């Protein structure tokens, strides 16, 4: 099986990138994101990307999933911005929340031109990079309800 | 406004509503007609009349080969199972990678022109499974009834040059079990008898961690044998067939194929990817589909991939318990997101552009 006349012949193209960049323009949460050095945090709430108030950054509900955008100046230019995007998956988050966090992490990457480097951060397995964002982490019991309807 | 999610497997339709945690309709992708040569029956009702019907699958190896019967399956899914009017529901369909472009062109044409859906999208099955696992990077082994695919994905983008495909999956394993059971003295030949063998396979087969040792164990005593009650009440005994059947996934020569086994196709797919991302793929091998349900398969994949990979490489096989439905669940999640729905083909766009639009919108 080869690629040329197949349903993957348009993968990896500029067209794919253009379509996904346009889709990312339709998420209000990204408007104004990544405009200055710092950490921005959203939580998945019934499939929606919901900002976390600044005063609660660094506290994470174990039942929930989050997107954490770290904007910083790269070594190559002190006046430009680069990005690490971490998605944090609580030990008790549900499948809809983790899957939405993953998809929306890609979307935020798209919105920022592909520049963010993605990091999957499962509770208990957080990278040194993620730990360093909170010089600490506070884990809270509970979380918001799943967006899934349960099929009996 | 609720979107429909339909994962048209070669063997099973999984269908339901976006936002649900599981498909509400799961039934065989079959059309049955009288074995002696309404006029036809679909899905569970064809299964209900298996005694008098010959069963035909309109999808072979992930590709629709009987469009008239496929339309019957879709009509049945909408009107008889889900009991919805399809013109009222945006519809997400699925497809395996490396299919010929005409397959999704005709899928799009029939959805709009026959079923009058308001909008639709065709998604790559393995990508849906990766998102269902909560990942943007990993390599999916998606093995159903028709195709086994290796799909490496990095930061949400499948790497098309490294995607690999093998037309060996559950249907071939069922056929092989029918053959080797016939060689034990239990004749299974008809399309009806095949479905009994498929049940034996799902209930009793497993992947041995060391195949040669397991053959020796089976020949030395009956400690691995299992009894199985037939519909007529007769009790048969199966032995080494329990693990010889799925061993074919690792040794395709069992069915006369010279292809690499699933451990080797996985390794070969990782090796087609840039060196520095292989580490993330090795640690995130995600199993998807019914043919990855055999007990022992994750442990065997871990062993076999460890033997092929660098000695310093962290290897991990992820086996979601729900993986018979991972594709569908990933679709339910993505179809619940407004930005993903923004990418779907509308009826007005189809009316303007025709089937070619599917390649410009669905990635
Ligand atoms: N527990 C099990 N052990 C082994 N095989 C199983 C088990 N459960 C289901 N299967 C097989 O898995 C296949 C159906 O899996 P499924 O993932 O629904 O395939 P599909 O999506 O219909 N086909 P495809 O077009 O290749 O993706 C059949 O061959 C089943 O016999
Ligand atoms: Ca939650
Ligand atoms: Ca990126
Ligand atoms: Mg499938």
Residue numbers in the entry:
A (entry chain B): 7 to 141, 144 to 160
B (entry chain A): 5 to 41, 50 to 375
Report text from the authors:
Actin is one of the most abundant proteins in eukaryotic cells and plays essential roles in various cellular activities, including locomotion, division, and transcription control. The dynamic assembly of actin is controlled by the hydrolysis of ATP, bound to the center of the molecule. Upon polymerization, actin undergoes a conformational change from the monomeric G-form to the fibrous F-form, which is associated with the flipping of the side chain of His161 toward ATP. Here, we report the crystal structures of the three mutant actins bound to AMPPNP or ADP-Pi determined at a resolution of 1.35–1.55 Å, which are stabilized in the F-form conformation with the aid of the fragmin F1 domain.
We found that His161 in A108G was not flipped as in G-actin, despite the overall actin structure adopting the F-form. This indicated that His161 flips to avoid steric hindrance caused by the methyl group of Ala108 approaching upon the flattening of the actin molecules. The non-flipped His161 affects the positions of W1 and W2. As a result, while maintaining a near in-line position (167°), W1 is located far from both PG (4.0 Å) and W2 (3.6 Å). Thus, the configuration of the two key water molecules in the active site suggests that the ATP hydrolysis activity of A108G is low even when the overall conformation adopts the F-form. This simple analysis supports the aforementioned hypothesis and shows that non-flipped His161 is favorable in the G-form, whereas flipped His161 is favorable in the F-form; in addition, A108G allows both flipped and non-flipped His161. On the other hand, in the case of Nε2-protonated His161 (ε-tautomer), the ring formed stable hydrogen bonds with the surrounding water molecules, and the shift of the ring was small (∼ 0.5 Å). This suggested that non-flipped His161 in A108G would adopt ε-tautomer.
